[PDB]
């Protein structure tokens, strides 16, 4: 298991524009296109991202390309983040992947807001971090996903994802 497989599990893969859980237009492996309600605006962003007139449809290769860029962007955001980096640096490989998943999902900014949990993780207080992380809108809005990430932080293993 690795970050790509992990996220592929959490996000799925969709070749036509769709709305994700909060109702925003997305495509591929969780590639947010726009927060705007306009489908046109979404199609514009998509063409721009792809570099062609897509008509709202991409191929599998294009989706994987956006995915590689997004993963890359997520790691980079972490490393550049003053609150994030130190945590990331103190963690083991499995757990690093869990933090990358949250950032891919909610952005750097949103993740850096988890002050107390970040602190707990830094101190390797697994059980406590897990309970703190659950006290969030994130957990209440996408509980199955949240549970898989939280368990990964808790255990430091990929068990939450074995079977999927």
Curated annotation (Swiss-Prot):
Consequence recorded when altering residue 117 to I: 500-fold decrease in enzymatic activity
Pfam families: Phage_lysozyme
The UniProt record lists the keyword Hydrolase: yes
Positions of the catalytic residues: 11, 20
Alphabetically ordered keywords of this record: Antimicrobial, Bacteriolytic enzyme, Cytolysis, Glycosidase, Host cell lysis by virus, Host cytoplasm, Hydrolase, Viral release from host cell
Protein's cellular compartments: Host cytoplasm
GO BP, sorted A to Z: cell wall macromolecule catabolic process; defense response to bacterium; peptidoglycan catabolic process; viral release from host cell by cytolysis
Impact when changing residue 30 to F: Almost complete loss of enzymatic activity. The enzyme is destabilized by 1.5 kcal/mol
Effect of residue 117 to F: 10-fold decrease in enzymatic activity
Gene Ontology molecular-function annotations: lysozyme activity
Enzyme class: hydrolase
Function: Endolysin with lysozyme activity that degrades host peptidoglycans and participates with the holin and spanin proteins in the sequential events which lead to the programmed host cell lysis releasing the mature viral particles. Once the holin has permeabilized the host cell membrane, the endolysin can reach the periplasm and break down the peptidoglycan layer.
Recorded family membership: Belongs to the glycosyl hydrolase 24 family.
Name of the protein in its database record: Endolysin
Provenance organism: Enterobacteria phage T4 (Bacteriophage T4)
């Amino acid at each position: 298991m690795n970050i790509f497989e992990m996220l592929r599990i959490d996000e799925g893969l969709r070749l036509k524009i769709y709305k994700e859980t909060e109702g925003y237009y997305t495509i591929g492996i969780g590639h947010l296109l726009t927060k705007s309600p306009s489908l046109n605006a979404a199609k514009s962003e998509l063409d721009k991202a792809i570099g062609r007139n897509t008509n709202g449809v991409i191929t599998k290769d294009e989706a994987e390309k956006l995915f590689n860029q997004d993963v890359d962007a997520a790691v980079r955001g972490i490393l550049r983040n003053a609150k994030l980096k130190p945590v990331y640096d103190s963690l083991d490989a499995v757990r690093r992947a869990a933090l990358i998943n949250m950032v891919f999902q909610m952005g750097e900014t949103g993740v850096a807001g988890f002050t107390n949990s970040l602190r707990m993780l830094q101190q390797k207080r697994w059980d406590e971090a897990a309970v703190n992380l659950a006290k969030s809108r994130w957990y209440n809005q996408t509980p199955n996903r949240a549970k898989r990430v939280i368990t990964t932080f808790r255990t430091g293993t990929w068990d939450a994802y074995k079977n999927l």
